[PDB]
Design a protein around this ligand. Structure first.
Ligand SMILES: [Fe+3]
Ligand SMILES: [Mg+2]
Ligand SMILES: [Mg+2]
Ligand SMILES: [Mg+2]
Ligand SMILES: [Mg+2]
Ligand SMILES: [Mg+2]
Ligand SMILES: [Mg+2]
Ligand SMILES: [Mg+2]
Ligand SMILES: [Mg+2]
Ligand SMILES: [Mg+2]
Ligand SMILES: [Mg+2]
Lengths: 174, 174, 173, 173, 173, 173
């Protein structure tokens, strides 16, 4: 029954990876939705849109690499429905960022829970893969997003209407 | 209520674009499921995997550009769940290509129905948009996929074991 | 009468093209007025002026390309007076953009009436010309003007006096 | 039973594409016959010859592209005899340009009957293919040929003996 | 009350700069009309068309630079209707060239009137501006067009049919 | 009434050259049919199609070069219908090549009967032309086609399904 390549790869880890695949695809979709909001003619912050589109494509890459890992270890990929995001209207540049921060923290939780699952099953390869490709990336993104929320807040966003405009230019422009 | 940019853009065209968006996201996911399959150690056809990963990324491109068009015309993007594919085991390179042909024919059907809806609402811009970016690329993909299916069959795939291996090298490795 | 090249080209299409030539030239003049206004020493927004000057030249190119199409199909160009813009004083950066938007949507509406006329006379060449060179340019222009209007509004133009200044630098510069 | 790739492609469109193909090939032969005539030691207008040679090759490309389309849509090509042109002797530069103008108007009318067929069958891919590669190319060509005929006439062709010689140098060379 | 930058700029010079602007724009439109006539399939003189298109764009540049001067000096631009040219059919290359000469002379006379006015108001900046960018450009244009008229005439235009054809290649190519 | 350049050019040679022109154009059409066939979605051998398309264009060039020779020698070109190929469906890679081989040998036979005719009429220039440009080209084409047919057969074409596919890649790719 098991793959000829399979070794030290617990069925709980396999299952966890397929959930994590789902989650990265979800995040990709969330970011795509945010991107689309900022491209609207009545929002119209082009570098906010471009920033989220770029983040959407990075999340897809995160999902594809986890698919590759699955196949490497001789697990089997089981896709599920990718759920629409919880809203269509993201309200403002500040709120989009706070929602991305929250998302990224959720995804980091899931990943830290995976690493623990890997640790308890004594799977150092999987521990290393997660550490090497996902954990510092997340930490870096969380810090970035926090830095963005902080600046947009101190600037008076979203009520002070120059704020999101100038941030779009100077921080995301780049 | 309506967007400041909105002109000659019927609510049914809007709704139809949002459905087409979902369908293109669906297609992308079908193609990624196939890519994952060919990457399995017990399938191990690397250019079939690369070919479908590439189709998957193209379909995501198709979705994104339909979202750009939606914003351009002043419609509002309403995302839905992306449904998983109808299976995770694609059986063989021949079968994957026949399913791909089928898929592309389904997507062309929807595009042609969208074009008809645009024509009946006298939306020449939407007609042109669909013509210019979608209909020709569909006819081209449908013809390519049919050529692939024909070759794999004439070659004796999948029962003749060298067929999928060589096709992988000569047709999909170029 | 008829031209040796004239095929499947209805005289109502021939008249409607001459009206569209006039409208494109009219839009060129409106844009030129706007550019002049932003070059005023008491208005003094250089990138707004440059922006409208560029749009004014694009409209002249649209007019010239309809003239070439008319001659191509064996129609005859008949020119009319280009009317002056409805005002001299465009009042602010926001206001000018919003008048530009209104202007582009009036042109777009005319071009869609043109396409409809060409559809009903079964002139697929004229339908394709219009789609290929006018309709998607219009849609893109309308989206851009719409974007610009929104940012200016969101910024507090015109009453927050730094709004048009910075828009002039970061978006039009 | 139908091709595995066939979708939304009516049997009458398939038939009409096969007739267009033959027409394109016929026109190529007509242009080649003209090239042959101008290369005669008793006519000897090298650039007329080269012009009609280039037109012949273009028309063959048109034919090939329609066959590509037939196969893309899952149609089946059925070739027919390419009829010889209606004469061997084309008389003059002017007369050959006039006959070329009549030929391209006849092929255009057949493309327009094809596009009205495509439209009637709700085949937007075929309609766009025809617009994109055939209809604008036909109008350009008819306009060019009309321009040539008009200059040759104004020049005094063929009775003023210098007219086709100089045209051949200045316009066609 | 007047612009912060206004100094030594009389109200009549300001009005008279607004009439000149309109004159330059009319002349642009006149040259465009002439361009369109030479692009007709029944006239078909491509270089005569290019030439007058080029003159059209120059005249518009002349209008634009006059709008610039107006703002530089603190005057206000007041645009008027641009009147259609006095005809649509320009008859021949010779006659278009003859009418182009009469047009450039009428514009020159208006510039000379404008300079007299600048002189009488002791506006040396305006006089210099007119001499530098307009007066010697006009004289060169008027000499060029006279030269074109003279050749066309000596060549037998428009009755000698080869005349406008060969002028079009040798002088205007 | 003979051409001013005609010398030592018999009217049977003149008629025979007109027949070879028709035969070369026929060969061009045959090979184009074949190309269209391999481009079918249910045949789908791209390098086969590519191969026969290049052959079709080479045959058109052979036809055009005989047309030039005819004019060179003072003969007059008389064009005939180009008959359609004897079928539409070329059944397989192997079969098409065997048909091309038979085709090339029929054209070579015609070219040898032509040479014989120019020999019997003592037309050493026509003999030389035929040899220099036709005869060794046919010999090489015939050899190449025979090589292809032999490899396809040895390979198990068309019953072994991989044969034409692999041949398409390695020999024609
Ligand atoms: Fe700033
Ligand atoms: Mg991630
Ligand atoms: Mg560790
Ligand atoms: Mg798609
Ligand atoms: Mg249409
Ligand atoms: Mg326009
Ligand atoms: Mg053609
Ligand atoms: Mg089109
Ligand atoms: Mg001037
Ligand atoms: Mg001076
Ligand atoms: Mg040959």
């Amino acid at each position: 029954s098991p793959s000829q390549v399979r070794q030290n790869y617990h069925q709980d880890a396999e299952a966890a990876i397929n959930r994590q695949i789902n989650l990265e695809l979800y995040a990709s979709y969330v970011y795509l939705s945010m991107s689309c909001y900022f491209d609207r003619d009545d929002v119209a912050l082009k570098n906010f849109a471009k920033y989220f589109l770029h983040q959407s494509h990075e999340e897809r890459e995160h999902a594809e690499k986890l698919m590759k890992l699955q196949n490497q270890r001789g697990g089997r990929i089981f896709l599920q429905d990718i759920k629409k995001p919880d809203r269509d209207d993201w309200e403002s540049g500040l709120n989009a960022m706070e929602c991305a921060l929250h998302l990224e923290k959720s995804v980091n939780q899931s990943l830290l829970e995976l690493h623990k699952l890997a640790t308890d099953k004594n799977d150092p390869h999987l521990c290393d893969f997660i550490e090497t490709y996902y954990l510092s990336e997340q930490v870096k993104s969380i810090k970035e997003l926090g830095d963005h929320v902080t600046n947009l807040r101190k600037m008076g966003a979203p009520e002070a209407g120059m704020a999101e405009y100038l941030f779009d230019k100077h921080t995301l422009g780049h």
